[PDB]
Amino acid sequence: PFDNTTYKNLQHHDYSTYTFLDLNLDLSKFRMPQPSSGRESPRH
Amino acid sequence: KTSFGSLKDEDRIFTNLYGRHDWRLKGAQSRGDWYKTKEILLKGPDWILGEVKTSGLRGRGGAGFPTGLKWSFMNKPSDGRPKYLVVNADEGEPGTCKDREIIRHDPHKLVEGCLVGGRAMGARAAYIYIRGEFYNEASNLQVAIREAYEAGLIGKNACGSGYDFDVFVVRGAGAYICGEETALIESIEGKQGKPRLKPPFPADVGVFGCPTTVANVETVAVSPTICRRGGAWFASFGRERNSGTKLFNISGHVNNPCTVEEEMSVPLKELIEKHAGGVTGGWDNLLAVIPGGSSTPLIPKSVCETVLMDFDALIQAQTGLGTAAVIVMDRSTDIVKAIARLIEFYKHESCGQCTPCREGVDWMNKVMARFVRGDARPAEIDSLWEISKQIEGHTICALGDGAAWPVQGLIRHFRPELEERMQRFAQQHQ
Amino acid sequence: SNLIEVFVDGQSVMVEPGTTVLQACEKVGMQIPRFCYHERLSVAGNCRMCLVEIEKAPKVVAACAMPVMKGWNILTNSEKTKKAREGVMEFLLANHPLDCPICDQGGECDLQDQSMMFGSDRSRFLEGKRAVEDKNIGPLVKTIMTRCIQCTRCIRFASEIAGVDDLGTTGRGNDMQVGTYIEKMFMSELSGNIIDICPVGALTSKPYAFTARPWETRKTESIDVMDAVG
Amino acid sequence: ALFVHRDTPKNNPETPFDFTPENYKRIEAIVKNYPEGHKAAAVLPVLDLAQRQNGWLPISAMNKVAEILQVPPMRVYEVATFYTMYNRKPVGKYHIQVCTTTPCMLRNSDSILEAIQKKLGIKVGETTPDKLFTLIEVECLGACVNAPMVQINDNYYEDLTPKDIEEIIDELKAGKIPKPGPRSGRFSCEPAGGLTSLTEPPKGPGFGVQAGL
Ligand SMILES: NC(=O)C1=CN([C@@H]2O[C@H](COP(=O)(O)OP(=O)(O)OC[C@H]3O[C@@H](n4cnc5c(N)ncnc54)[C@H](O)[C@@H]3O)[C@@H](O)[C@H]2O)C=CC1
Ligand SMILES: Cc1cc2nc3c(=O)[nH]c(=O)nc-3n(C[C@H](O)[C@H](O)[C@H](O)COP(=O)(O)O)c2cc1C
Ligand code: SF4
Ligand code: SF4
Ligand code: SF4
Ligand code: FES
Ligand code: FES
Ligand SMILES: [K+]
């Protein structure tokens, strides 16, 4: 059924303070290894 | 084709702009998103660049640079450093709220645009720099990115095409200057959001010193539709070198302030009277229009009658298209107070690295405060014109030009009103 | 040879690749004004005093950071180069304090010298100036930050040569200040060189304070014997 | 609004602060988002996480961020002082930010500001005596077609009238969080007089695909 009389973006009413951070923490498993510049820091 | 506008709903790239449909993956996949992406990823980078530059798409950030050449600047063999595609989702320009709608309602279109753009220039990953104030939009984008990762559309072997691509979201911390591409690059790296000097261009030295291409949300989200429908379909709308569609935010003293997609060469009067329901008090109550947000000079009522909202015709009206943010002020508006508030915004949002903006923008703020009060003389009006000319073109970034331009437009189009203000202050206070 | 050819005021000069506009102009004896560029520090390019005009190009470039490509003609004494210099000098002197008689940099101030040489002769500023709270970084360096022009030689020296990383920039816009943000003493073995490289009287020598003026001092070139470096 | 720090009993380097272990795992994820050799790029999100945990930034979170990222503390001081979202003073539980830029000023945002002022009995930049509300004035927030609007913490309240913002404040004093949306008839950004565009159902997959793809 085609419905355009309702707002479907109602999920953000239940977001907490840490939601972005736990989303990133759960996403951390799928991500690929990062490239390295060869040193720990530019000050090293 | 001479007349432009009245775009059909079948030609709109940004469906579900108003959020009336499902923004998640299941609803987006039924609207054409993530369709045949393996074919575009397997057709090569040069084919994608050719499809982009045949459509004639120009940058939607506000500079209006051609997108095909800018993206093909990174079509070079790598020298051991990775390459990065960075999406500018700051949107700190007043009057502009289109990217918030694109992120909040069509996140999967942005993710597919990131993947297609990264394949077009061999990017290792994607860094989306959203505004720090857009917490809910950032969380929606993270949810959609998680849904894309779990479905195998991005990550290792993205879309089954053998290409490896990651999408990251970085939240800002409330700085308008971080919308500048080099300042955005510096802010991603953990430094203060101060812009760099060019050269080196971001295609040579960008984020972490790697090759980097900074692209707007609007010019990235349309790229899968460009590669899918074709470049000639996008070029069929608009004039020469003004091809395609554009999202307009009509706001201010208007009946229905709204965000709407339209053809690029639409008349301003037709756009206002059709989509926004007209200005308050009818068209004869119009006093001034700022067509491209706070970074563009304003135009009076006599110019908005016969003007077109593309790059070239607005350039010929000694203003700019900008971010296509139409701010409307009627006859019940103090124009001097509005421009003074704009200059106060530019003084508050200025990184202060380079001398002319750091000193001169505060100087213009004080001068326009005295102009609002009327405590000046016309010699100071010409002095302010000279100061604005001194700021423009002598700065590191384009915030100085964006602070000089509105004052120049206000002076040029409303010098008699300012002069009447100061002469009535002089004759009242003495 | 890998040298390319550029032109300074129409005079040909062979320069190495990677040479800046400033060094190319220095090769023929022309010294473009600077406030932030130092030859022993990294290039910051924020004072905008070195804005020179390249011919057949509708924009002035920063000579301290712009590399020269071949066929370029540099106009060091054109009209718009002088206009850019006058505008930048006016912006630098807009918020500067009227402290020249009470400041130790008088008579050897770079700001005074290339305001007299390259700037205008009068002020259009009809507003009030700013005032910056002074800081304490040790018994060696007297700090008066109302006179600072935010040239950021402090941070570049303390990070790239002294290697201390204690100085920085806090704030945004006109309220941006140079300091350590806490009551910290910048005490190193190379602290007085920040007095040396400050182009204005913002950092001065506390033992030398209020004692002499630079025009009346006789200079004798000698060798330090305090250590074995010589 | 001072960009220098003076030692107080409330704010000193000896003020206790440390991250929770779950926040340590979140910090690990943030660090893993960045390439090796560029660990300093995570100064911004870790500092934001410290502010989210604490509510404000004393000079103990800045030193903790400098310690766990191996960066000088001066760089963390620069980062904290440059950006306006970081609070270096203890704000109240609800931080109300009212946008007064010109597209919001044209739609009578100062009426909302004075409505909040007489409802709370304070002025701009001040805090209520019971430490529940803080009222400041900000620049544009990217909701210009939904002007006038305010932002309370993460939430946006748009298309507000004085009655609507008074209702929001009264409901916030009761402990219930309102719906972060426009209070007018429209939902997000559509015209109030119906949908002038996107009124048709979307065509779906495979519509308008060029040949050879
Ligand atoms: N969208 C927004 O929120 C805002 C937009 N603007 C608009 O943005 C513009 C200023 O932005 P900018 O990117 O600083 O200006 P624009 O002149 O430089 O450059 C646009 C892009 O083209 C690239 N580019 C241009 N020439 C190049 C060359 N020869 N080689 C390599 N790359 C080259 C630049 O690297 C940049 O990414 C103005 O038009 C202003 O109105 C201003 C304020 C806010
Ligand atoms: C002060 C300033 C602020 C800017 N803010 C933004 C912004 O918020 N979003 C954006 O897309 N571009 C912004 N830009 C323009 C960028 O520099 C750059 O042109 C854009 O991010 C990418 O251009 P494109 O549309 O060709 O991809 C800003 C520029 C300046 C000078
Ligand atoms: S023009 Fe202003 S905002 Fe841009 S680099 Fe200079 S000081 Fe910073
Ligand atoms: S630093 Fe130079 S310009 Fe400033 S008060 Fe001292 S002598 Fe005068
Ligand atoms: S105190 Fe002197 S050297 Fe340091 S930033 Fe200011 S002008 Fe430059
Ligand atoms: S000397 Fe080049 S900008 Fe300062
Ligand atoms: S002007 Fe207020 S949200 Fe943009
Ligand atoms: K000095």
From TrEMBL, chain A:
Keywords on record: Electron transport, Membrane, Mitochondrion, Mitochondrion inner membrane, Phosphoprotein, Respiratory chain, Transit peptide, Transport
GO cellular component: mitochondrial inner membrane; respiratory chain complex I
Top-level taxon: Eukaryota
GO BP terms in the entry: mitochondrial ATP synthesis coupled electron transport
Protein localization: Mitochondrion inner membrane
Principal location class: mitochondrion
Quaternary structure and interacting proteins, as annotated: Complex I is composed of 45 different subunits. This is a component of the flavoprotein-sulfur (FP) fragment of the enzyme.
Biological role stated in the UniProt entry: Accessory subunit of the mitochondrial membrane respiratory chain NADH dehydrogenase (Complex I), that is believed not to be involved in catalysis. Complex I functions in the transfer of electrons from NADH to the respiratory chain. The immediate electron acceptor for the enzyme is believed to be ubiquinone. May be the terminally assembled subunit of Complex I.
Family stated for the protein in its record: Belongs to the complex I NDUFV3 subunit family.
Protein name: NADH dehydrogenase [ubiquinone] flavoprotein 3, mitochondrial
Range within the parent protein: 66 to 109 of 109
